[PDB]
Amino acid sequence: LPWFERVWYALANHPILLAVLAAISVILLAWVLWRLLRIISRRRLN
Amino acid sequence: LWQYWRGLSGWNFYFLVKFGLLWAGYLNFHPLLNLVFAAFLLMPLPRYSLHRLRHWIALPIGFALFWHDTWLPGPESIMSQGSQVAGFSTDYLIDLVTRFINWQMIGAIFVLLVAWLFLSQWIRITVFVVAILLWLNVLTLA
Amino acid sequence: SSLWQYWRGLSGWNFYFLVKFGLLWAGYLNFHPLLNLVFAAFLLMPLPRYSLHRLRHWIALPIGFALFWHDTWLPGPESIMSQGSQVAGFSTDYLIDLVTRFINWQMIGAIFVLLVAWLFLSQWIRITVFVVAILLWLNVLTLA
Amino acid sequence: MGSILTRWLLIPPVNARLIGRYRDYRRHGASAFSATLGCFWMILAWIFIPLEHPRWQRIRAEHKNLYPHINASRPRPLDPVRYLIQTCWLLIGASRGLQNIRGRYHQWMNELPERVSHKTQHLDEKKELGHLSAGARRLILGIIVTFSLILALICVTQPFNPLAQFIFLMLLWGVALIVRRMPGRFSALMLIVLSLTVSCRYIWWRYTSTLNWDDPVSLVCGLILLFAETYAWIVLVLGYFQVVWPLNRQPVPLPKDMSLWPSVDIFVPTYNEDLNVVKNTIYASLGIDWPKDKLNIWILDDGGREEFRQFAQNVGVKYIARTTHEHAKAGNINNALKYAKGEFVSIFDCDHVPTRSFLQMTMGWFLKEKQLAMMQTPHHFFSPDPFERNLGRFRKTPNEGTLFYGLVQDGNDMWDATFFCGSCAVIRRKPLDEIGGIAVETVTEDAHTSLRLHRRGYTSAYMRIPQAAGLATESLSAHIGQRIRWARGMVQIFRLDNPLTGKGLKFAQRLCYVNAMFHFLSGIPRLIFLTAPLAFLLLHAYIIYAPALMIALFVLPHMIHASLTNSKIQGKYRHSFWSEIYETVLAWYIAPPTLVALINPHKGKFNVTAKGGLVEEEYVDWVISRPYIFLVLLNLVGVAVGIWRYFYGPPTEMLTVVVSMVWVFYNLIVLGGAVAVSVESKQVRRSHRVEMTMPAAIAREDGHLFSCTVQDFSDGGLGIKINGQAQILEGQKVNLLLKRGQQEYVFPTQVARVMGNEVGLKLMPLTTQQHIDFVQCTFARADTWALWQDSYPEDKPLESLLDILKLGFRGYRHLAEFAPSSVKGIFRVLTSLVSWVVSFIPRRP
């Protein structure tokens, strides 16, 4: 197949693995979000 | 006389146990005698002293009646054969006793006791006991 | 003095029975319905004195454990003591391996979930009513 | 059953008791049949139940509390069943180391702040090291951005079977419940990202898998719904962006040297409002804690009324009128700007009473930040709005505007996108003159002026401290009329001065302005959601071409995660589901004027909103309720056809009928809430009472001074509580002593009512100076309005859902309070069913 459907096929039977990857993605996007919001408030101080 | 009618109090449990044993097939139930006994217990007595007397009299009678209803050998048979049992070693007696006592039955009686204590607060158990007694008598006559 | 102020729900023992029911349903337990009922009855029995309550808990703990063990297929303490000298010769690595094979992490997780469910539900509903109802029901099934 | 038969069968005492009871039942309105049956049951109860037992005595004594739905004096034949059901309910769901768990939970709760404080120390401690290689750092934070976006894209796009989708849903919901319990801003950010991931998964599934291409009717209805859902998803994304990090800006202290304090012109525009409304704003403005040589107050009278000119002269304030009534408030302010000379301009609506601290709390930031052109403060209202008044929820639930001023504008300040709201603001004169004054091209001159200031690169700030309070709209008609104007004006700005395509705005400012304009387009999407389930029921149109189970497994996650995240972020400023009532009431009325402004922005007249009127009687505004009644009737036809389809339709469609019916029932609850708001409640008092606890004294004519506490005040009088045994008589003249700082002021009052220690005082005719001093001792105090905002309870989504369900029934009962058809007759059927429903949902004791 391609590459986007191969990834979908490999993950289709693993809902727990996808939920863990979703939780990791949420933590990483949030935390970097915290840091960068602090950085934008610092640019505001600028 | 309304004020003098006191439910079968603790004797409700006595009859419940009997019914349970009857149902299990351990008792030859004499319906009329048990009804008479129940009638004796329900009889309205105005004086507190008569009530105490009744309880005292009822205890031996109840026991006797229960024994009578049971397949157990009469006190005469035990006394005449009892001298043969006095020669049994304590270990044998314990073994016999353990074999004779169905711990499951004891547990059931206990559960029934707790149930009765709990239900007697919500429902008049006497009404049911008397109804069943009446019913059992009717079955014996039909 | 109405014996009534003294009727206390199965408190923590509700969870004990729920776990038992869950295991029975999974087929891991030979459930003796009458003995468990007797135990439940013992726990529900009205005791006026606080000291008697403490005593009950102390007595109930070993009994509950014993009864739980009995309802399980686990070898009797005698078999373990007589064969235990053979188990003392097993290397720590083997014992850990045996334990890991024996312990189904999925079952532990289920018990945990059940515990949380119970704590949560106990806030809204009297679980004792259900436990007693199921116990009564199971006994009726064994008699029919 | 006085029947010769009972006399023959029963003994005289028993018969007498039974007859007595029977008669008792008949006296209380029980049918003969019901009374007999009641006696019978009683007898049965006596036979089987020991009613003499202390337990049954307690239950009997508490009968009214335990069985509120059962009248013991009026027995009904089904009463036994009702008793059984209720008893079962009481026995089961009715409750309102293990003990150590509770205390330790609180121990950890107390530790949360302590640990949080340690974490902030560590936040700085890690920063006390957070440095390395900037190009690489950008790569590594940017490396986080790319990997996490790929993982999010896989989570959004992954096709699942129903079981795998259910497991995935339950795990994400479990993660949301764990994260929601964590305190602080970081858990709110995690809930935003999780809600966005689930909502993107929903919209992805909708666009790829749920359109029927083979049926044109299903396709058209499905595309109309997909448009409304796409709009709702855009507003969710932009809403989260706007409120992601509320700044909570604190006041900056002014220089100790008052010679460095700038000059300020205060503008109070009036059009046709009564002089008694404007007096309080002017008297409070005179009390502002600013140098008198640097403070100028202006009455801007667009009406040219001589009473206002004489009032201005008598009070020593400036007066200006104009001969051209062009551009209403904007034109009136722009006329005044030609004559005003102050470095700053403050604007108050003629009903907004400023606090003495207003300039001290706002001006310090303009000295710190030279590019700051505008500072906005909250609009606070001391009178109920029509939602608060008609629902009887004043100060119990956050009103419609509380979300906007409490959170959205504080979120805008993070993005330098705070916009002027027409009142309670300070504007720097030089930036305002550079843009040509207040904008006149749109009927929201205020938001458009702020857009122009930001396009020139000037900045704006928000101070989330109420520093003035005004009057709310007095009817739902006036309120809807005001919202129509704002909705039109915001869409006019979107067409004439578009934030996305026009030059000068920063990217974050563009998104904030677009979200503020898009919010007013909600009327069309809201009407689509109120009618969407009727497409399947009435037209057989498959608006979502998927199995009903898959619809539930995609829609429920999205709704739950969005609701949980909104409750965590907005729960102090908006209770759950209350937005849907506010939006549903406005939806029909804002949809036409916004669509017209989108096509032709120049079609709009400015209307003025009336303030200061009385509502003397409760009435239903049938002109305003017409659209809600139409949508209710249309949804009820949906219910009738859905019941018919459930019994006579294909078995394969039964779950689709059930899902559509659940949605129609939800729409009927929300529409019942909208109907409940449309019943205008009686406004008995001209003067609104402001609850405020302040120390005071009362002097009698004999010179005796008594300590008291003011409980409430109004323009005409005060409620006070006397400390001790004061012999005060009704009609007695007494002097009220109020304190303002170190100065004491005396106000002549008459005792209007005495209720033990609570005394109602009426103000006697005050001199102009005493009236100034009274307003400055009451409405214009520094603390009056600041204490009111922190008083709202935190949102609980399940309690708010129950409050709306009660409100809808109340609204059903409101369409029953007044109906032009059997609609109410239906509610008659509705309430027989709801006496059955008081039996149902177990009455929480």
Curated annotation (Swiss-Prot), chain A:
Stretches in topological domain Cytoplasmic: 35-46
Disulfide bonds: none
Places the protein is found: Cell inner membrane
Residue stretches spanning the membrane: 14-34
Organism superkingdom: Bacteria
Other noteworthy facts: The genes bscA, bcsB, bcsZ and bcsC are constitutively transcribed but cellulose synthesis occurs only when DgcC, a putative transmembrane protein regulated by CsgD, is expressed. Cellulose production is abolished in E.coli K12.
Protein function: Binds the cellulose synthase activator, bis-(3'-5') cyclic diguanylic acid (c-di-GMP).
Subunit structure: Tightly associated with the cellulose synthase catalytic subunit.
Sequence similarity: Belongs to the AcsB/BcsB family.
Protein name, entry field: Cyclic di-GMP-binding protein
Species of provenance: Escherichia coli (strain K12)
Swiss-Prot record, chain C:
Gene ablation phenotype (knockout): When the bcsEFG operon is disrupted in a cellulose-synthesizing strain (a strain K12 / W3110 derivative called AR3110 with a restored, functional bcsQ gene), cellulose is no longer made.
Bilayer-spanning residue ranges: 23-43, 57-77, 102-122, 127-144
Subcellular location(s) of the protein: Cell inner membrane
Other comments on record: Cellulose production is abolished in E.coli K12 / MG1655 and W3110 due to a premature stop codon in bcsQ.
Protein name per UniProt: Cellulose biosynthesis protein BcsG
Encoding gene per record: bcsG
UniProtKB/Swiss-Prot annotation, chain D:
All copies of domain PilZ, residue ranges: 683-779
Region (Catalytic subdomain A): 260-353
Segments passing through the bilayer: 31-51, 140-160, 162-182, 219-239, 514-534, 536-556, 581-601, 629-649, 657-677, 822-842
Annotated residues for binding of substrate: 349, 351
Deletion phenotype: When disrupted in a cellulose-synthesizing strain (a strain K12 / W3110 derivative called AR3110 with a restored, functional bcsQ gene), cellulose is no longer made and the rdar morphotype is lost.
Keywords: c-di-GMP, Cell inner membrane, Cell membrane, Cellulose biosynthesis, Glycosyltransferase, Membrane, Transferase, Transmembrane, Transmembrane helix
Reaction catalysed by this enzyme: [(1->4)-beta-D-glucosyl](n) + UDP-alpha-D-glucose = [(1->4)-beta-D-glucosyl](n+1) + UDP + H(+)
Pathway membership, UniProt: Glycan metabolism; bacterial cellulose biosynthesis
Its biological purpose: Catalytic subunit of cellulose synthase. It polymerizes uridine 5'-diphosphate glucose to cellulose, which is produced as an extracellular component for mechanical and chemical protection at the onset of the stationary phase, when the cells exhibit multicellular behavior (rdar morphotype). Coexpression of cellulose and thin aggregative fimbriae (curli fimbrae or fibers) leads to a hydrophobic network with tightly packed cells embedded in a highly inert matrix that confers cohesion, elasticity and tissue-like properties to colonies.
Note: The genes bscA, bcsB, bcsZ and bcsC are constitutively transcribed but cellulose synthesis occurs only when DgcC, a putative transmembrane protein regulated by CsgD, is expressed. Cellulose production is abolished in E.coli K12 / MG1655 and W3110 due to a premature stop codon in bcsQ.
Protein name: Cellulose synthase catalytic subunit [UDP-forming]
Native source species: Escherichia coli (strain K12)
Lineage of source species: Bacteria, Pseudomonadati, Pseudomonadota, Gammaproteobacteria, Enterobacterales
